Design a protein around this nucleic acid. Structure first.
Ligand SMILES: O=c1ccn([C@@H]2O[C@H](COP(=O)(O)OP(=O)(O)OP(=O)(O)O)[C@@H](O)[C@H]2O)c(=O)[nH]1
Ligand SMILES: [Mg+2]
Ligand SMILES: [Mg+2]
Ligand code: NA
Length: 327
DNA sequence: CGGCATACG
DNA sequence: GCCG
């Protein structure tokens, strides 16, 4: 079992679901307390379990696995012995965890805002609605639409959206293309949002595109919220439903075709997979990876990639399709 | 011990 | 919290 998640396939469904979910609760709780390092270790240990070929049934099977030390091993030990880990259950029912989860789930509210509201005594969404003067417009939209945004987006919803985005993109710039990224590209059946990547085959033609796309979607009455030159937009869309509609989060990113493999890799995820790949690139290969390119800081050169396959090869890694990047 | 991913809105 |  290699130490980095980008060195091993991780499928969407696996054989250690209960154990991985428990460790992810502790990772989430560590993030709420500001401990990025603890969050990473618990996330990494969970991801190791997702990569195993069969269920863990005995503690001895953790011996030698990366990211299992005294704490994560004890958690697994208790789940194997009793079906429950007391530390996890204590976190689950705690007011701090439940409120921080509730608040950070809001579009426009992160850990720091949630923590400040928690310390001020706020606990419920109606607590926030009663003091709307303390909310940004983004937070107001996230709070108004919170119920719909709490409903999973279905793969059935994604096809309909991609068609309307393609129509607007085609009027804004004929020949421009729309690619589904994020969790749906990794094979997820549900999501919290829909993520799209837009480009054009002629380098440079994509400049100025996203404002033209957003103006056209807004004119069609499909935009319930957006932030407005720019190249990323995090929006709330109106999606049709039987006799009505629902609000859906949609993310649009524009990249030049020269950078498209890097952007596709970066926005396909998973989040942990990309953090691990970027850490691997820098620490093991001395190369700096981001959504624009792969930089050699010694030669001061960028690696020209024509595909995601090219990027894995340049990092010395076996290629993983998106469905195996579910770290 | 240091390190823990990344850049745009 | 764990790795190197
Ligand atoms: O902190 C972050 C968030 C997101 N991303 C990059 O953006 C992509 C989309 O980020 P999303 O938050 O949309 O996640 P997801 O699609 O993987 O899962 P859902 O909760 O939406 O079902 C992620 O898969 C990752 O590639 C990061 O690199 N870092
Ligand atoms: Mg997504
Ligand atoms: Mg998204
Ligand atoms: Na949030």
């Amino acid at each position: 079992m290699p130490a980095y998640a980008c060195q091993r396939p991780t499928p969407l469904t696996h054989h250690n679901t209960g154990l991985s979910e428990a460790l992810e609760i502790l990772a989430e709780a560590a993030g709420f307390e500001g401990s990025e390092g603890r969050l990473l270790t618990f996330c990494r240990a969970a991801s190791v379990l997702k990569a195993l070929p069969s269920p863990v049934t005995t503690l001895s099977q953790l011996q030698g696995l990366p990211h299992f030390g005294e704490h994560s091993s004890r958690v697994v030990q208790e789940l194997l012995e009793h079906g429950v880990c007391e530390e996890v259950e204590r976190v689950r029912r705690s007011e701090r965890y439940q409120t921080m989860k509730l608040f950070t789930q809001i579009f426009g509210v992160g850990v720091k805002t949630a923590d400040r509201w928690y310390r001020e005594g706020l606990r419920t969404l109606d607590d926030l609605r009663e003091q709307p003067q303390k909310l940004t417009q983004q937070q107001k939209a996230g709070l108004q639409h919170h119920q719909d945004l709490s409903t999973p987006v279905l793969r059935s919803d994604v096809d309909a959206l991609q068609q309307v985005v393609e129509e607007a993109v085609g009027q804004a710039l004929p020949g421009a293309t729309v690619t589904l990224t994020g969790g749906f590209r990794r094979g997820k059946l549900q999501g919290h949002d829909v993520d799209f990547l837009i480009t054009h085959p002629k380098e440079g033609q994509e400049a100025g595109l996203l404002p033209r796309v957003m103006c056209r979607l807004q004119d069609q009455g499909l935009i319930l919220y957006h932030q407005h030159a720019f190249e990323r937009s995090f929006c709330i869309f109106r999606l049709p439903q039987p006799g009505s509609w629902k609000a859906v989060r949609v993310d649009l990113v524009v990249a030049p075709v020269s950078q498209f493999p890097f952007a596709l890799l970066a926005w396909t995820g998973s989040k942990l997979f990309q953090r691990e790949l970027r850490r691997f690139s820098r620490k093991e290969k001395g190369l700096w990876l981001n959504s624009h390119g792969l930089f050699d800081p010694e030669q001061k050169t960028f690696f020209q990639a024509a595909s995601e396959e090219d990027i894995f090869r340049h990092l010395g890694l076996e290629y993983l399709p998106p469905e195996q990047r579910n770290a």
